[PDB]
Amino acid sequence: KTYTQRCRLFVGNLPADITEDEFKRLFAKYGEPGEVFINKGKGFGFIKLESRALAEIAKAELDDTPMRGRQLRVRFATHAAALSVRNLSPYVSNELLEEAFSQFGPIERAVVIVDDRGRSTGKGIVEFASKPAARKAFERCSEGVFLLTTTPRPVIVEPLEQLDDEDGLPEKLAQKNPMYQKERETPPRFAQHGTFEYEYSQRWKSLDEMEKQQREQVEKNMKDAKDKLESEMEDAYHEHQANLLRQDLMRRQEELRRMEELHSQEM
Amino acid sequence: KTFTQRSRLFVGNLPPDITEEEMRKLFEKYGKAGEVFIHKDKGFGFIRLETRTLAEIAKVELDNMPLRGKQLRVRFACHSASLTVRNLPQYVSNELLEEAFSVFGQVERAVVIVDDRGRPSGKGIVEFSGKPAARKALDRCSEGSFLLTTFPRPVTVEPMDQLDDEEGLPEKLVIKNQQFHKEREQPPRFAQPGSFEYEYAMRWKALIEMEKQQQDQVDRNIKEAREKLEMEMEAARHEHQVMLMRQDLMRRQEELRRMEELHNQEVQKRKQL
């Protein structure tokens, strides 16, 4: 498609005395500019492009470029219409997530998170086109029950969290804190055998080892629970079928008894 | 910076007649090239580009077009020397990581993960340049206790789990075996209440809520222990100060007594003779 949310661009360090025409002139090289929202008070603006390739050439070309004494800052805006889905079966795919959640709105991207080898992590992420559609999907899968595969594995839906990766924590905002400087006075080190920081770091390491042990214990317990629940597919299936048959048979038996006694009275 | 691991590219589906000079001319539009590693028979190799911008542009503009009847597969290659750092102090910075972990080697990029609002997540992403340096940093921070500031909190270092969210799952790589058909008999849909699917999905969702409760309980236990240690800070510090001073005083008192007795016996043996 074209003009997707993922094609939004966050432009920073914009001079206050700028115009929309110059804004579109800057990005006139990559094609017809799309959405343009400019806030002159804060000196930031948004623009949406045609596709991911042109968006990336723009980010990688106009970044760190001087503009009337101000360095051009182009970053990515947070995708608001995000929704984390998980417990996915190992045979799900991008198009399945697209179609299944298309019923609750338009889908711009729904990628199944995979590890380095490409195997499914069992989770996924969906990026809706519009925020209220994502809210409706989250609700309908929260109270409602959504399945994706023959094996009844419901998909638990929770909102996604945004975490910056290509940008760390700026040093200037860290230095805004008065005590960061006095903390940094001691350089990073290994501690020294016998000093107070060494023994106390040993205590921290013991705590962290205990936490790792607890997390491993939980994950092993859970894997056990998943395996046990999977092993009981056909037992539960047959039990349900037999119970339905028994209930229908009991109803028919009651009907037989009632009709037969009525006919006996008539006779 | 320039010529980093972020500029390394994985080019696949190369023709069997591939040569170093031909690919070098292929990337001539993209400046200089780094290490030219090529496997002739398996049809892929490792290349290095000039900069990250150049790497992105070349990767995007060099994949999906055919070459001698073979569409290029130029995707992003995984980082072979990454490292994740946990439990970072409340006052940290990415340049703090660039300077602290520079001891174990050159840091191409280190990032303290920041959420939307600006608060630190408490984790980090560290990418050195080479595998042996990454291994030595990992095991040194494992056996050692690499502080970062005055607050005596070490940082646990673990290998980063590189999760890929670009390709996801195209249908072609999926096995499409009998299980696939067994798992595609019925399309995605809800569960009608009071049926087998709905009840069994309730079993699953109860299990998942148990997952949530257990993880939250572990989180709460760790947070309470952390608060307890934060309070025990000052008591431990003062106790260690007093213990060090007492031991030093004992040592120096012993030294004084030993020197005095040495001089005493020396003067006695001198005056006797």
The experimental technique behind this entry is cryo-EM
Beta-carbon separation of B191 and A152 below 8 A: yes
Quote the CA–CA distance of A183 and A24 in Å, as a whole number: 46
Angle at CA A122, nearest 5°, toward A121 and A123? Answer: 90
Six token digits for residue A79: 């995708």
Position of tokens 């001089």?
B263
Number of inter-chain CB pairs under 8 A, A vs B: 243
Please identify among residues 105-164 of chain A the ones whose CB lies closer than 8 Å to any CB of chain B.
Answer: 111-116, 118, 120-121, 125, 144-154, 156, 161-164
Closest CA to A3 of A49, A54, A45, A53: A49
Beta-carbon separation of A196 and B241 below 8 A: yes
Q: Residues followed by a break in chain B, C–N over 2.5 Å?
A: none
Judging contacts by C-beta atoms under 8 Å, the chain A residues touching residue B61 are 53
Six token digits for residue B248: 């030093």
By the CB < 8 Å criterion, does A174 face chain B?
yes
Quote the CA–CA distance of A10 and A162 in Å, as a whole number: 15
In this complex, the residue of A60, A174, A197 whose CB is nearest that of residue B152 is A197
Beta-bridge mates of residue A156 = A86
Quote the CA–CA distance of B227 and B135 in Å, as a whole number: 32
Instruction: Please tell me the distance in Å from B13's CA to the nearest CA on chain A.
Output: 18
Residue pair A123/A138 in contact (Cβ under 8 Å)? The answer is: no
Residue pair B225/B218 in contact (Cβ under 8 Å)? The answer is: no
Quote the CA–CA distance of B104 and B106 in Å, as a whole number: 7
Give the residue ranges of DSSP H helices in A154-232.
Answer: 171-176, 178-184, 196-231
By the CB < 8 Å criterion, does A184 face chain B?
yes
Instruction: Please tell me the distance in Å from B253's CA to the nearest CA on chain A.
Output: 21
- Name, in order, each residue with C-beta under 8 angstroms of B210's C-beta and a sequence gap of 6 or more: A225
Judging contacts by C-beta atoms under 8 Å, the chain B residues touching residue A229 are 203-204, 207
Beta-carbon separation of B180 and A91 below 8 A: yes
> Resolution of the deposited coordinates, in angstroms?
3.9
SS3 (DSSP) at A29:
helix
Beta-bridge mates of residue B66 = B71
Closest CA to B168 of A185, A109, A52, A108: A109
- Name, in order, each residue with C-beta under 8 angstroms of A39's C-beta and a sequence gap of 6 or more: A45
By the CB < 8 Å criterion, does A219 face chain B?
no
Phi-psi region of A68 (alpha: psi -120 to 50; beta: other; left: phi over 0): left
User: Which whole-number Å values give the CA distances from B255 to B46, B248, B258, B259, B260, in the listed order?
Assistant: 66, 10, 5, 6, 9
Residue pair A114/B167 in contact (Cβ under 8 Å)? The answer is: yes
DSSP assignment, residue A169? -
Pairing of strands B73-76, B120-128: unpaired
Quote the CA–CA distance of A34 and A18 in Å, as a whole number: 18
Six token digits for residue B92: 């940290």
Specify the DSSP element, H or E, that contains A5.
Answer: none
Judging contacts by C-beta atoms under 8 Å, the chain B residues touching residue A119 are none
Residue pair B62/B72 in contact (Cβ under 8 Å)? The answer is: yes
Residue pair A86/A37 in contact (Cβ under 8 Å)? The answer is: no
Residue pair B168/A93 in contact (Cβ under 8 Å)? The answer is: yes
SS3 (DSSP) at A163:
strand
In this complex, the residue of B52, B125, B201 whose CB is nearest that of residue A152 is B201
- What values do phi and psi take at B221, rounded to 5? -60, -45
Angle of the A52-62 helix axis to the B52-62 helix axis, nearest 10: 160
Beta-carbon separation of A145 and B202 below 8 A: yes
**Residue spans of beta strands (DSSP E) within A1-100:** 8-12, 36-39, 44-48, 65-67, 70-75, 82-86
- How would DSSP label each residue in chain B? --S-GGGEEEEES--TT--HHHHHHHGGGG------EEETTTTEEEEE-S-HHHHHHHHHHHSSSBSSS-B-EEEEPPPTTEEEEES--SS--HHHHHHHGGGSS-EEEEEEEEESSS-EEEEEEEEESSHHHHHHHHHHHHHS----SSS----EEE-----B-SS---TTTS---HHHHHTSSS-SEE--TTSHHHHHHHHHHHHHHHHHHHHHHHHHHHHHHHHHHHHHHHHHHHHHHHHHHHHHHHHHHHHHHHHHHHHHHHHHHHHH-
